[PDB]
């Protein structure tokens, strides 16, 4: 009986080995918006007798 | 200066073999303790670095 208590407690060191970490890359990246038309900012301005 | 001398009765000698019998256990006990913790520690633990 205090045989497995004593391999317990070592296969609970032996256990406590790390592995490996996951972790998602995502500084630098901003979304995209679209913008659907093109600003001329042009006016045509005409006399009245068209000369 | 009032030394009175010491009477070693019945009752005191049977109290003491009761005793005895409590240390043979307490001793046997701590024994089996020692070696088990000596146990543990050579297959758990190891060295310090700083």
Redesign the interface.
Known sequence: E?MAK?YG??AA?SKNVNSSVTYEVKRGTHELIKVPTIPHNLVLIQSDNGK | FALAQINADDEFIGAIDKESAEYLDEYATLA?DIS?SL??VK??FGPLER
């Open positions: 205090d004593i407690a070592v060191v | 089996r088990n146990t543990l297959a758990a």
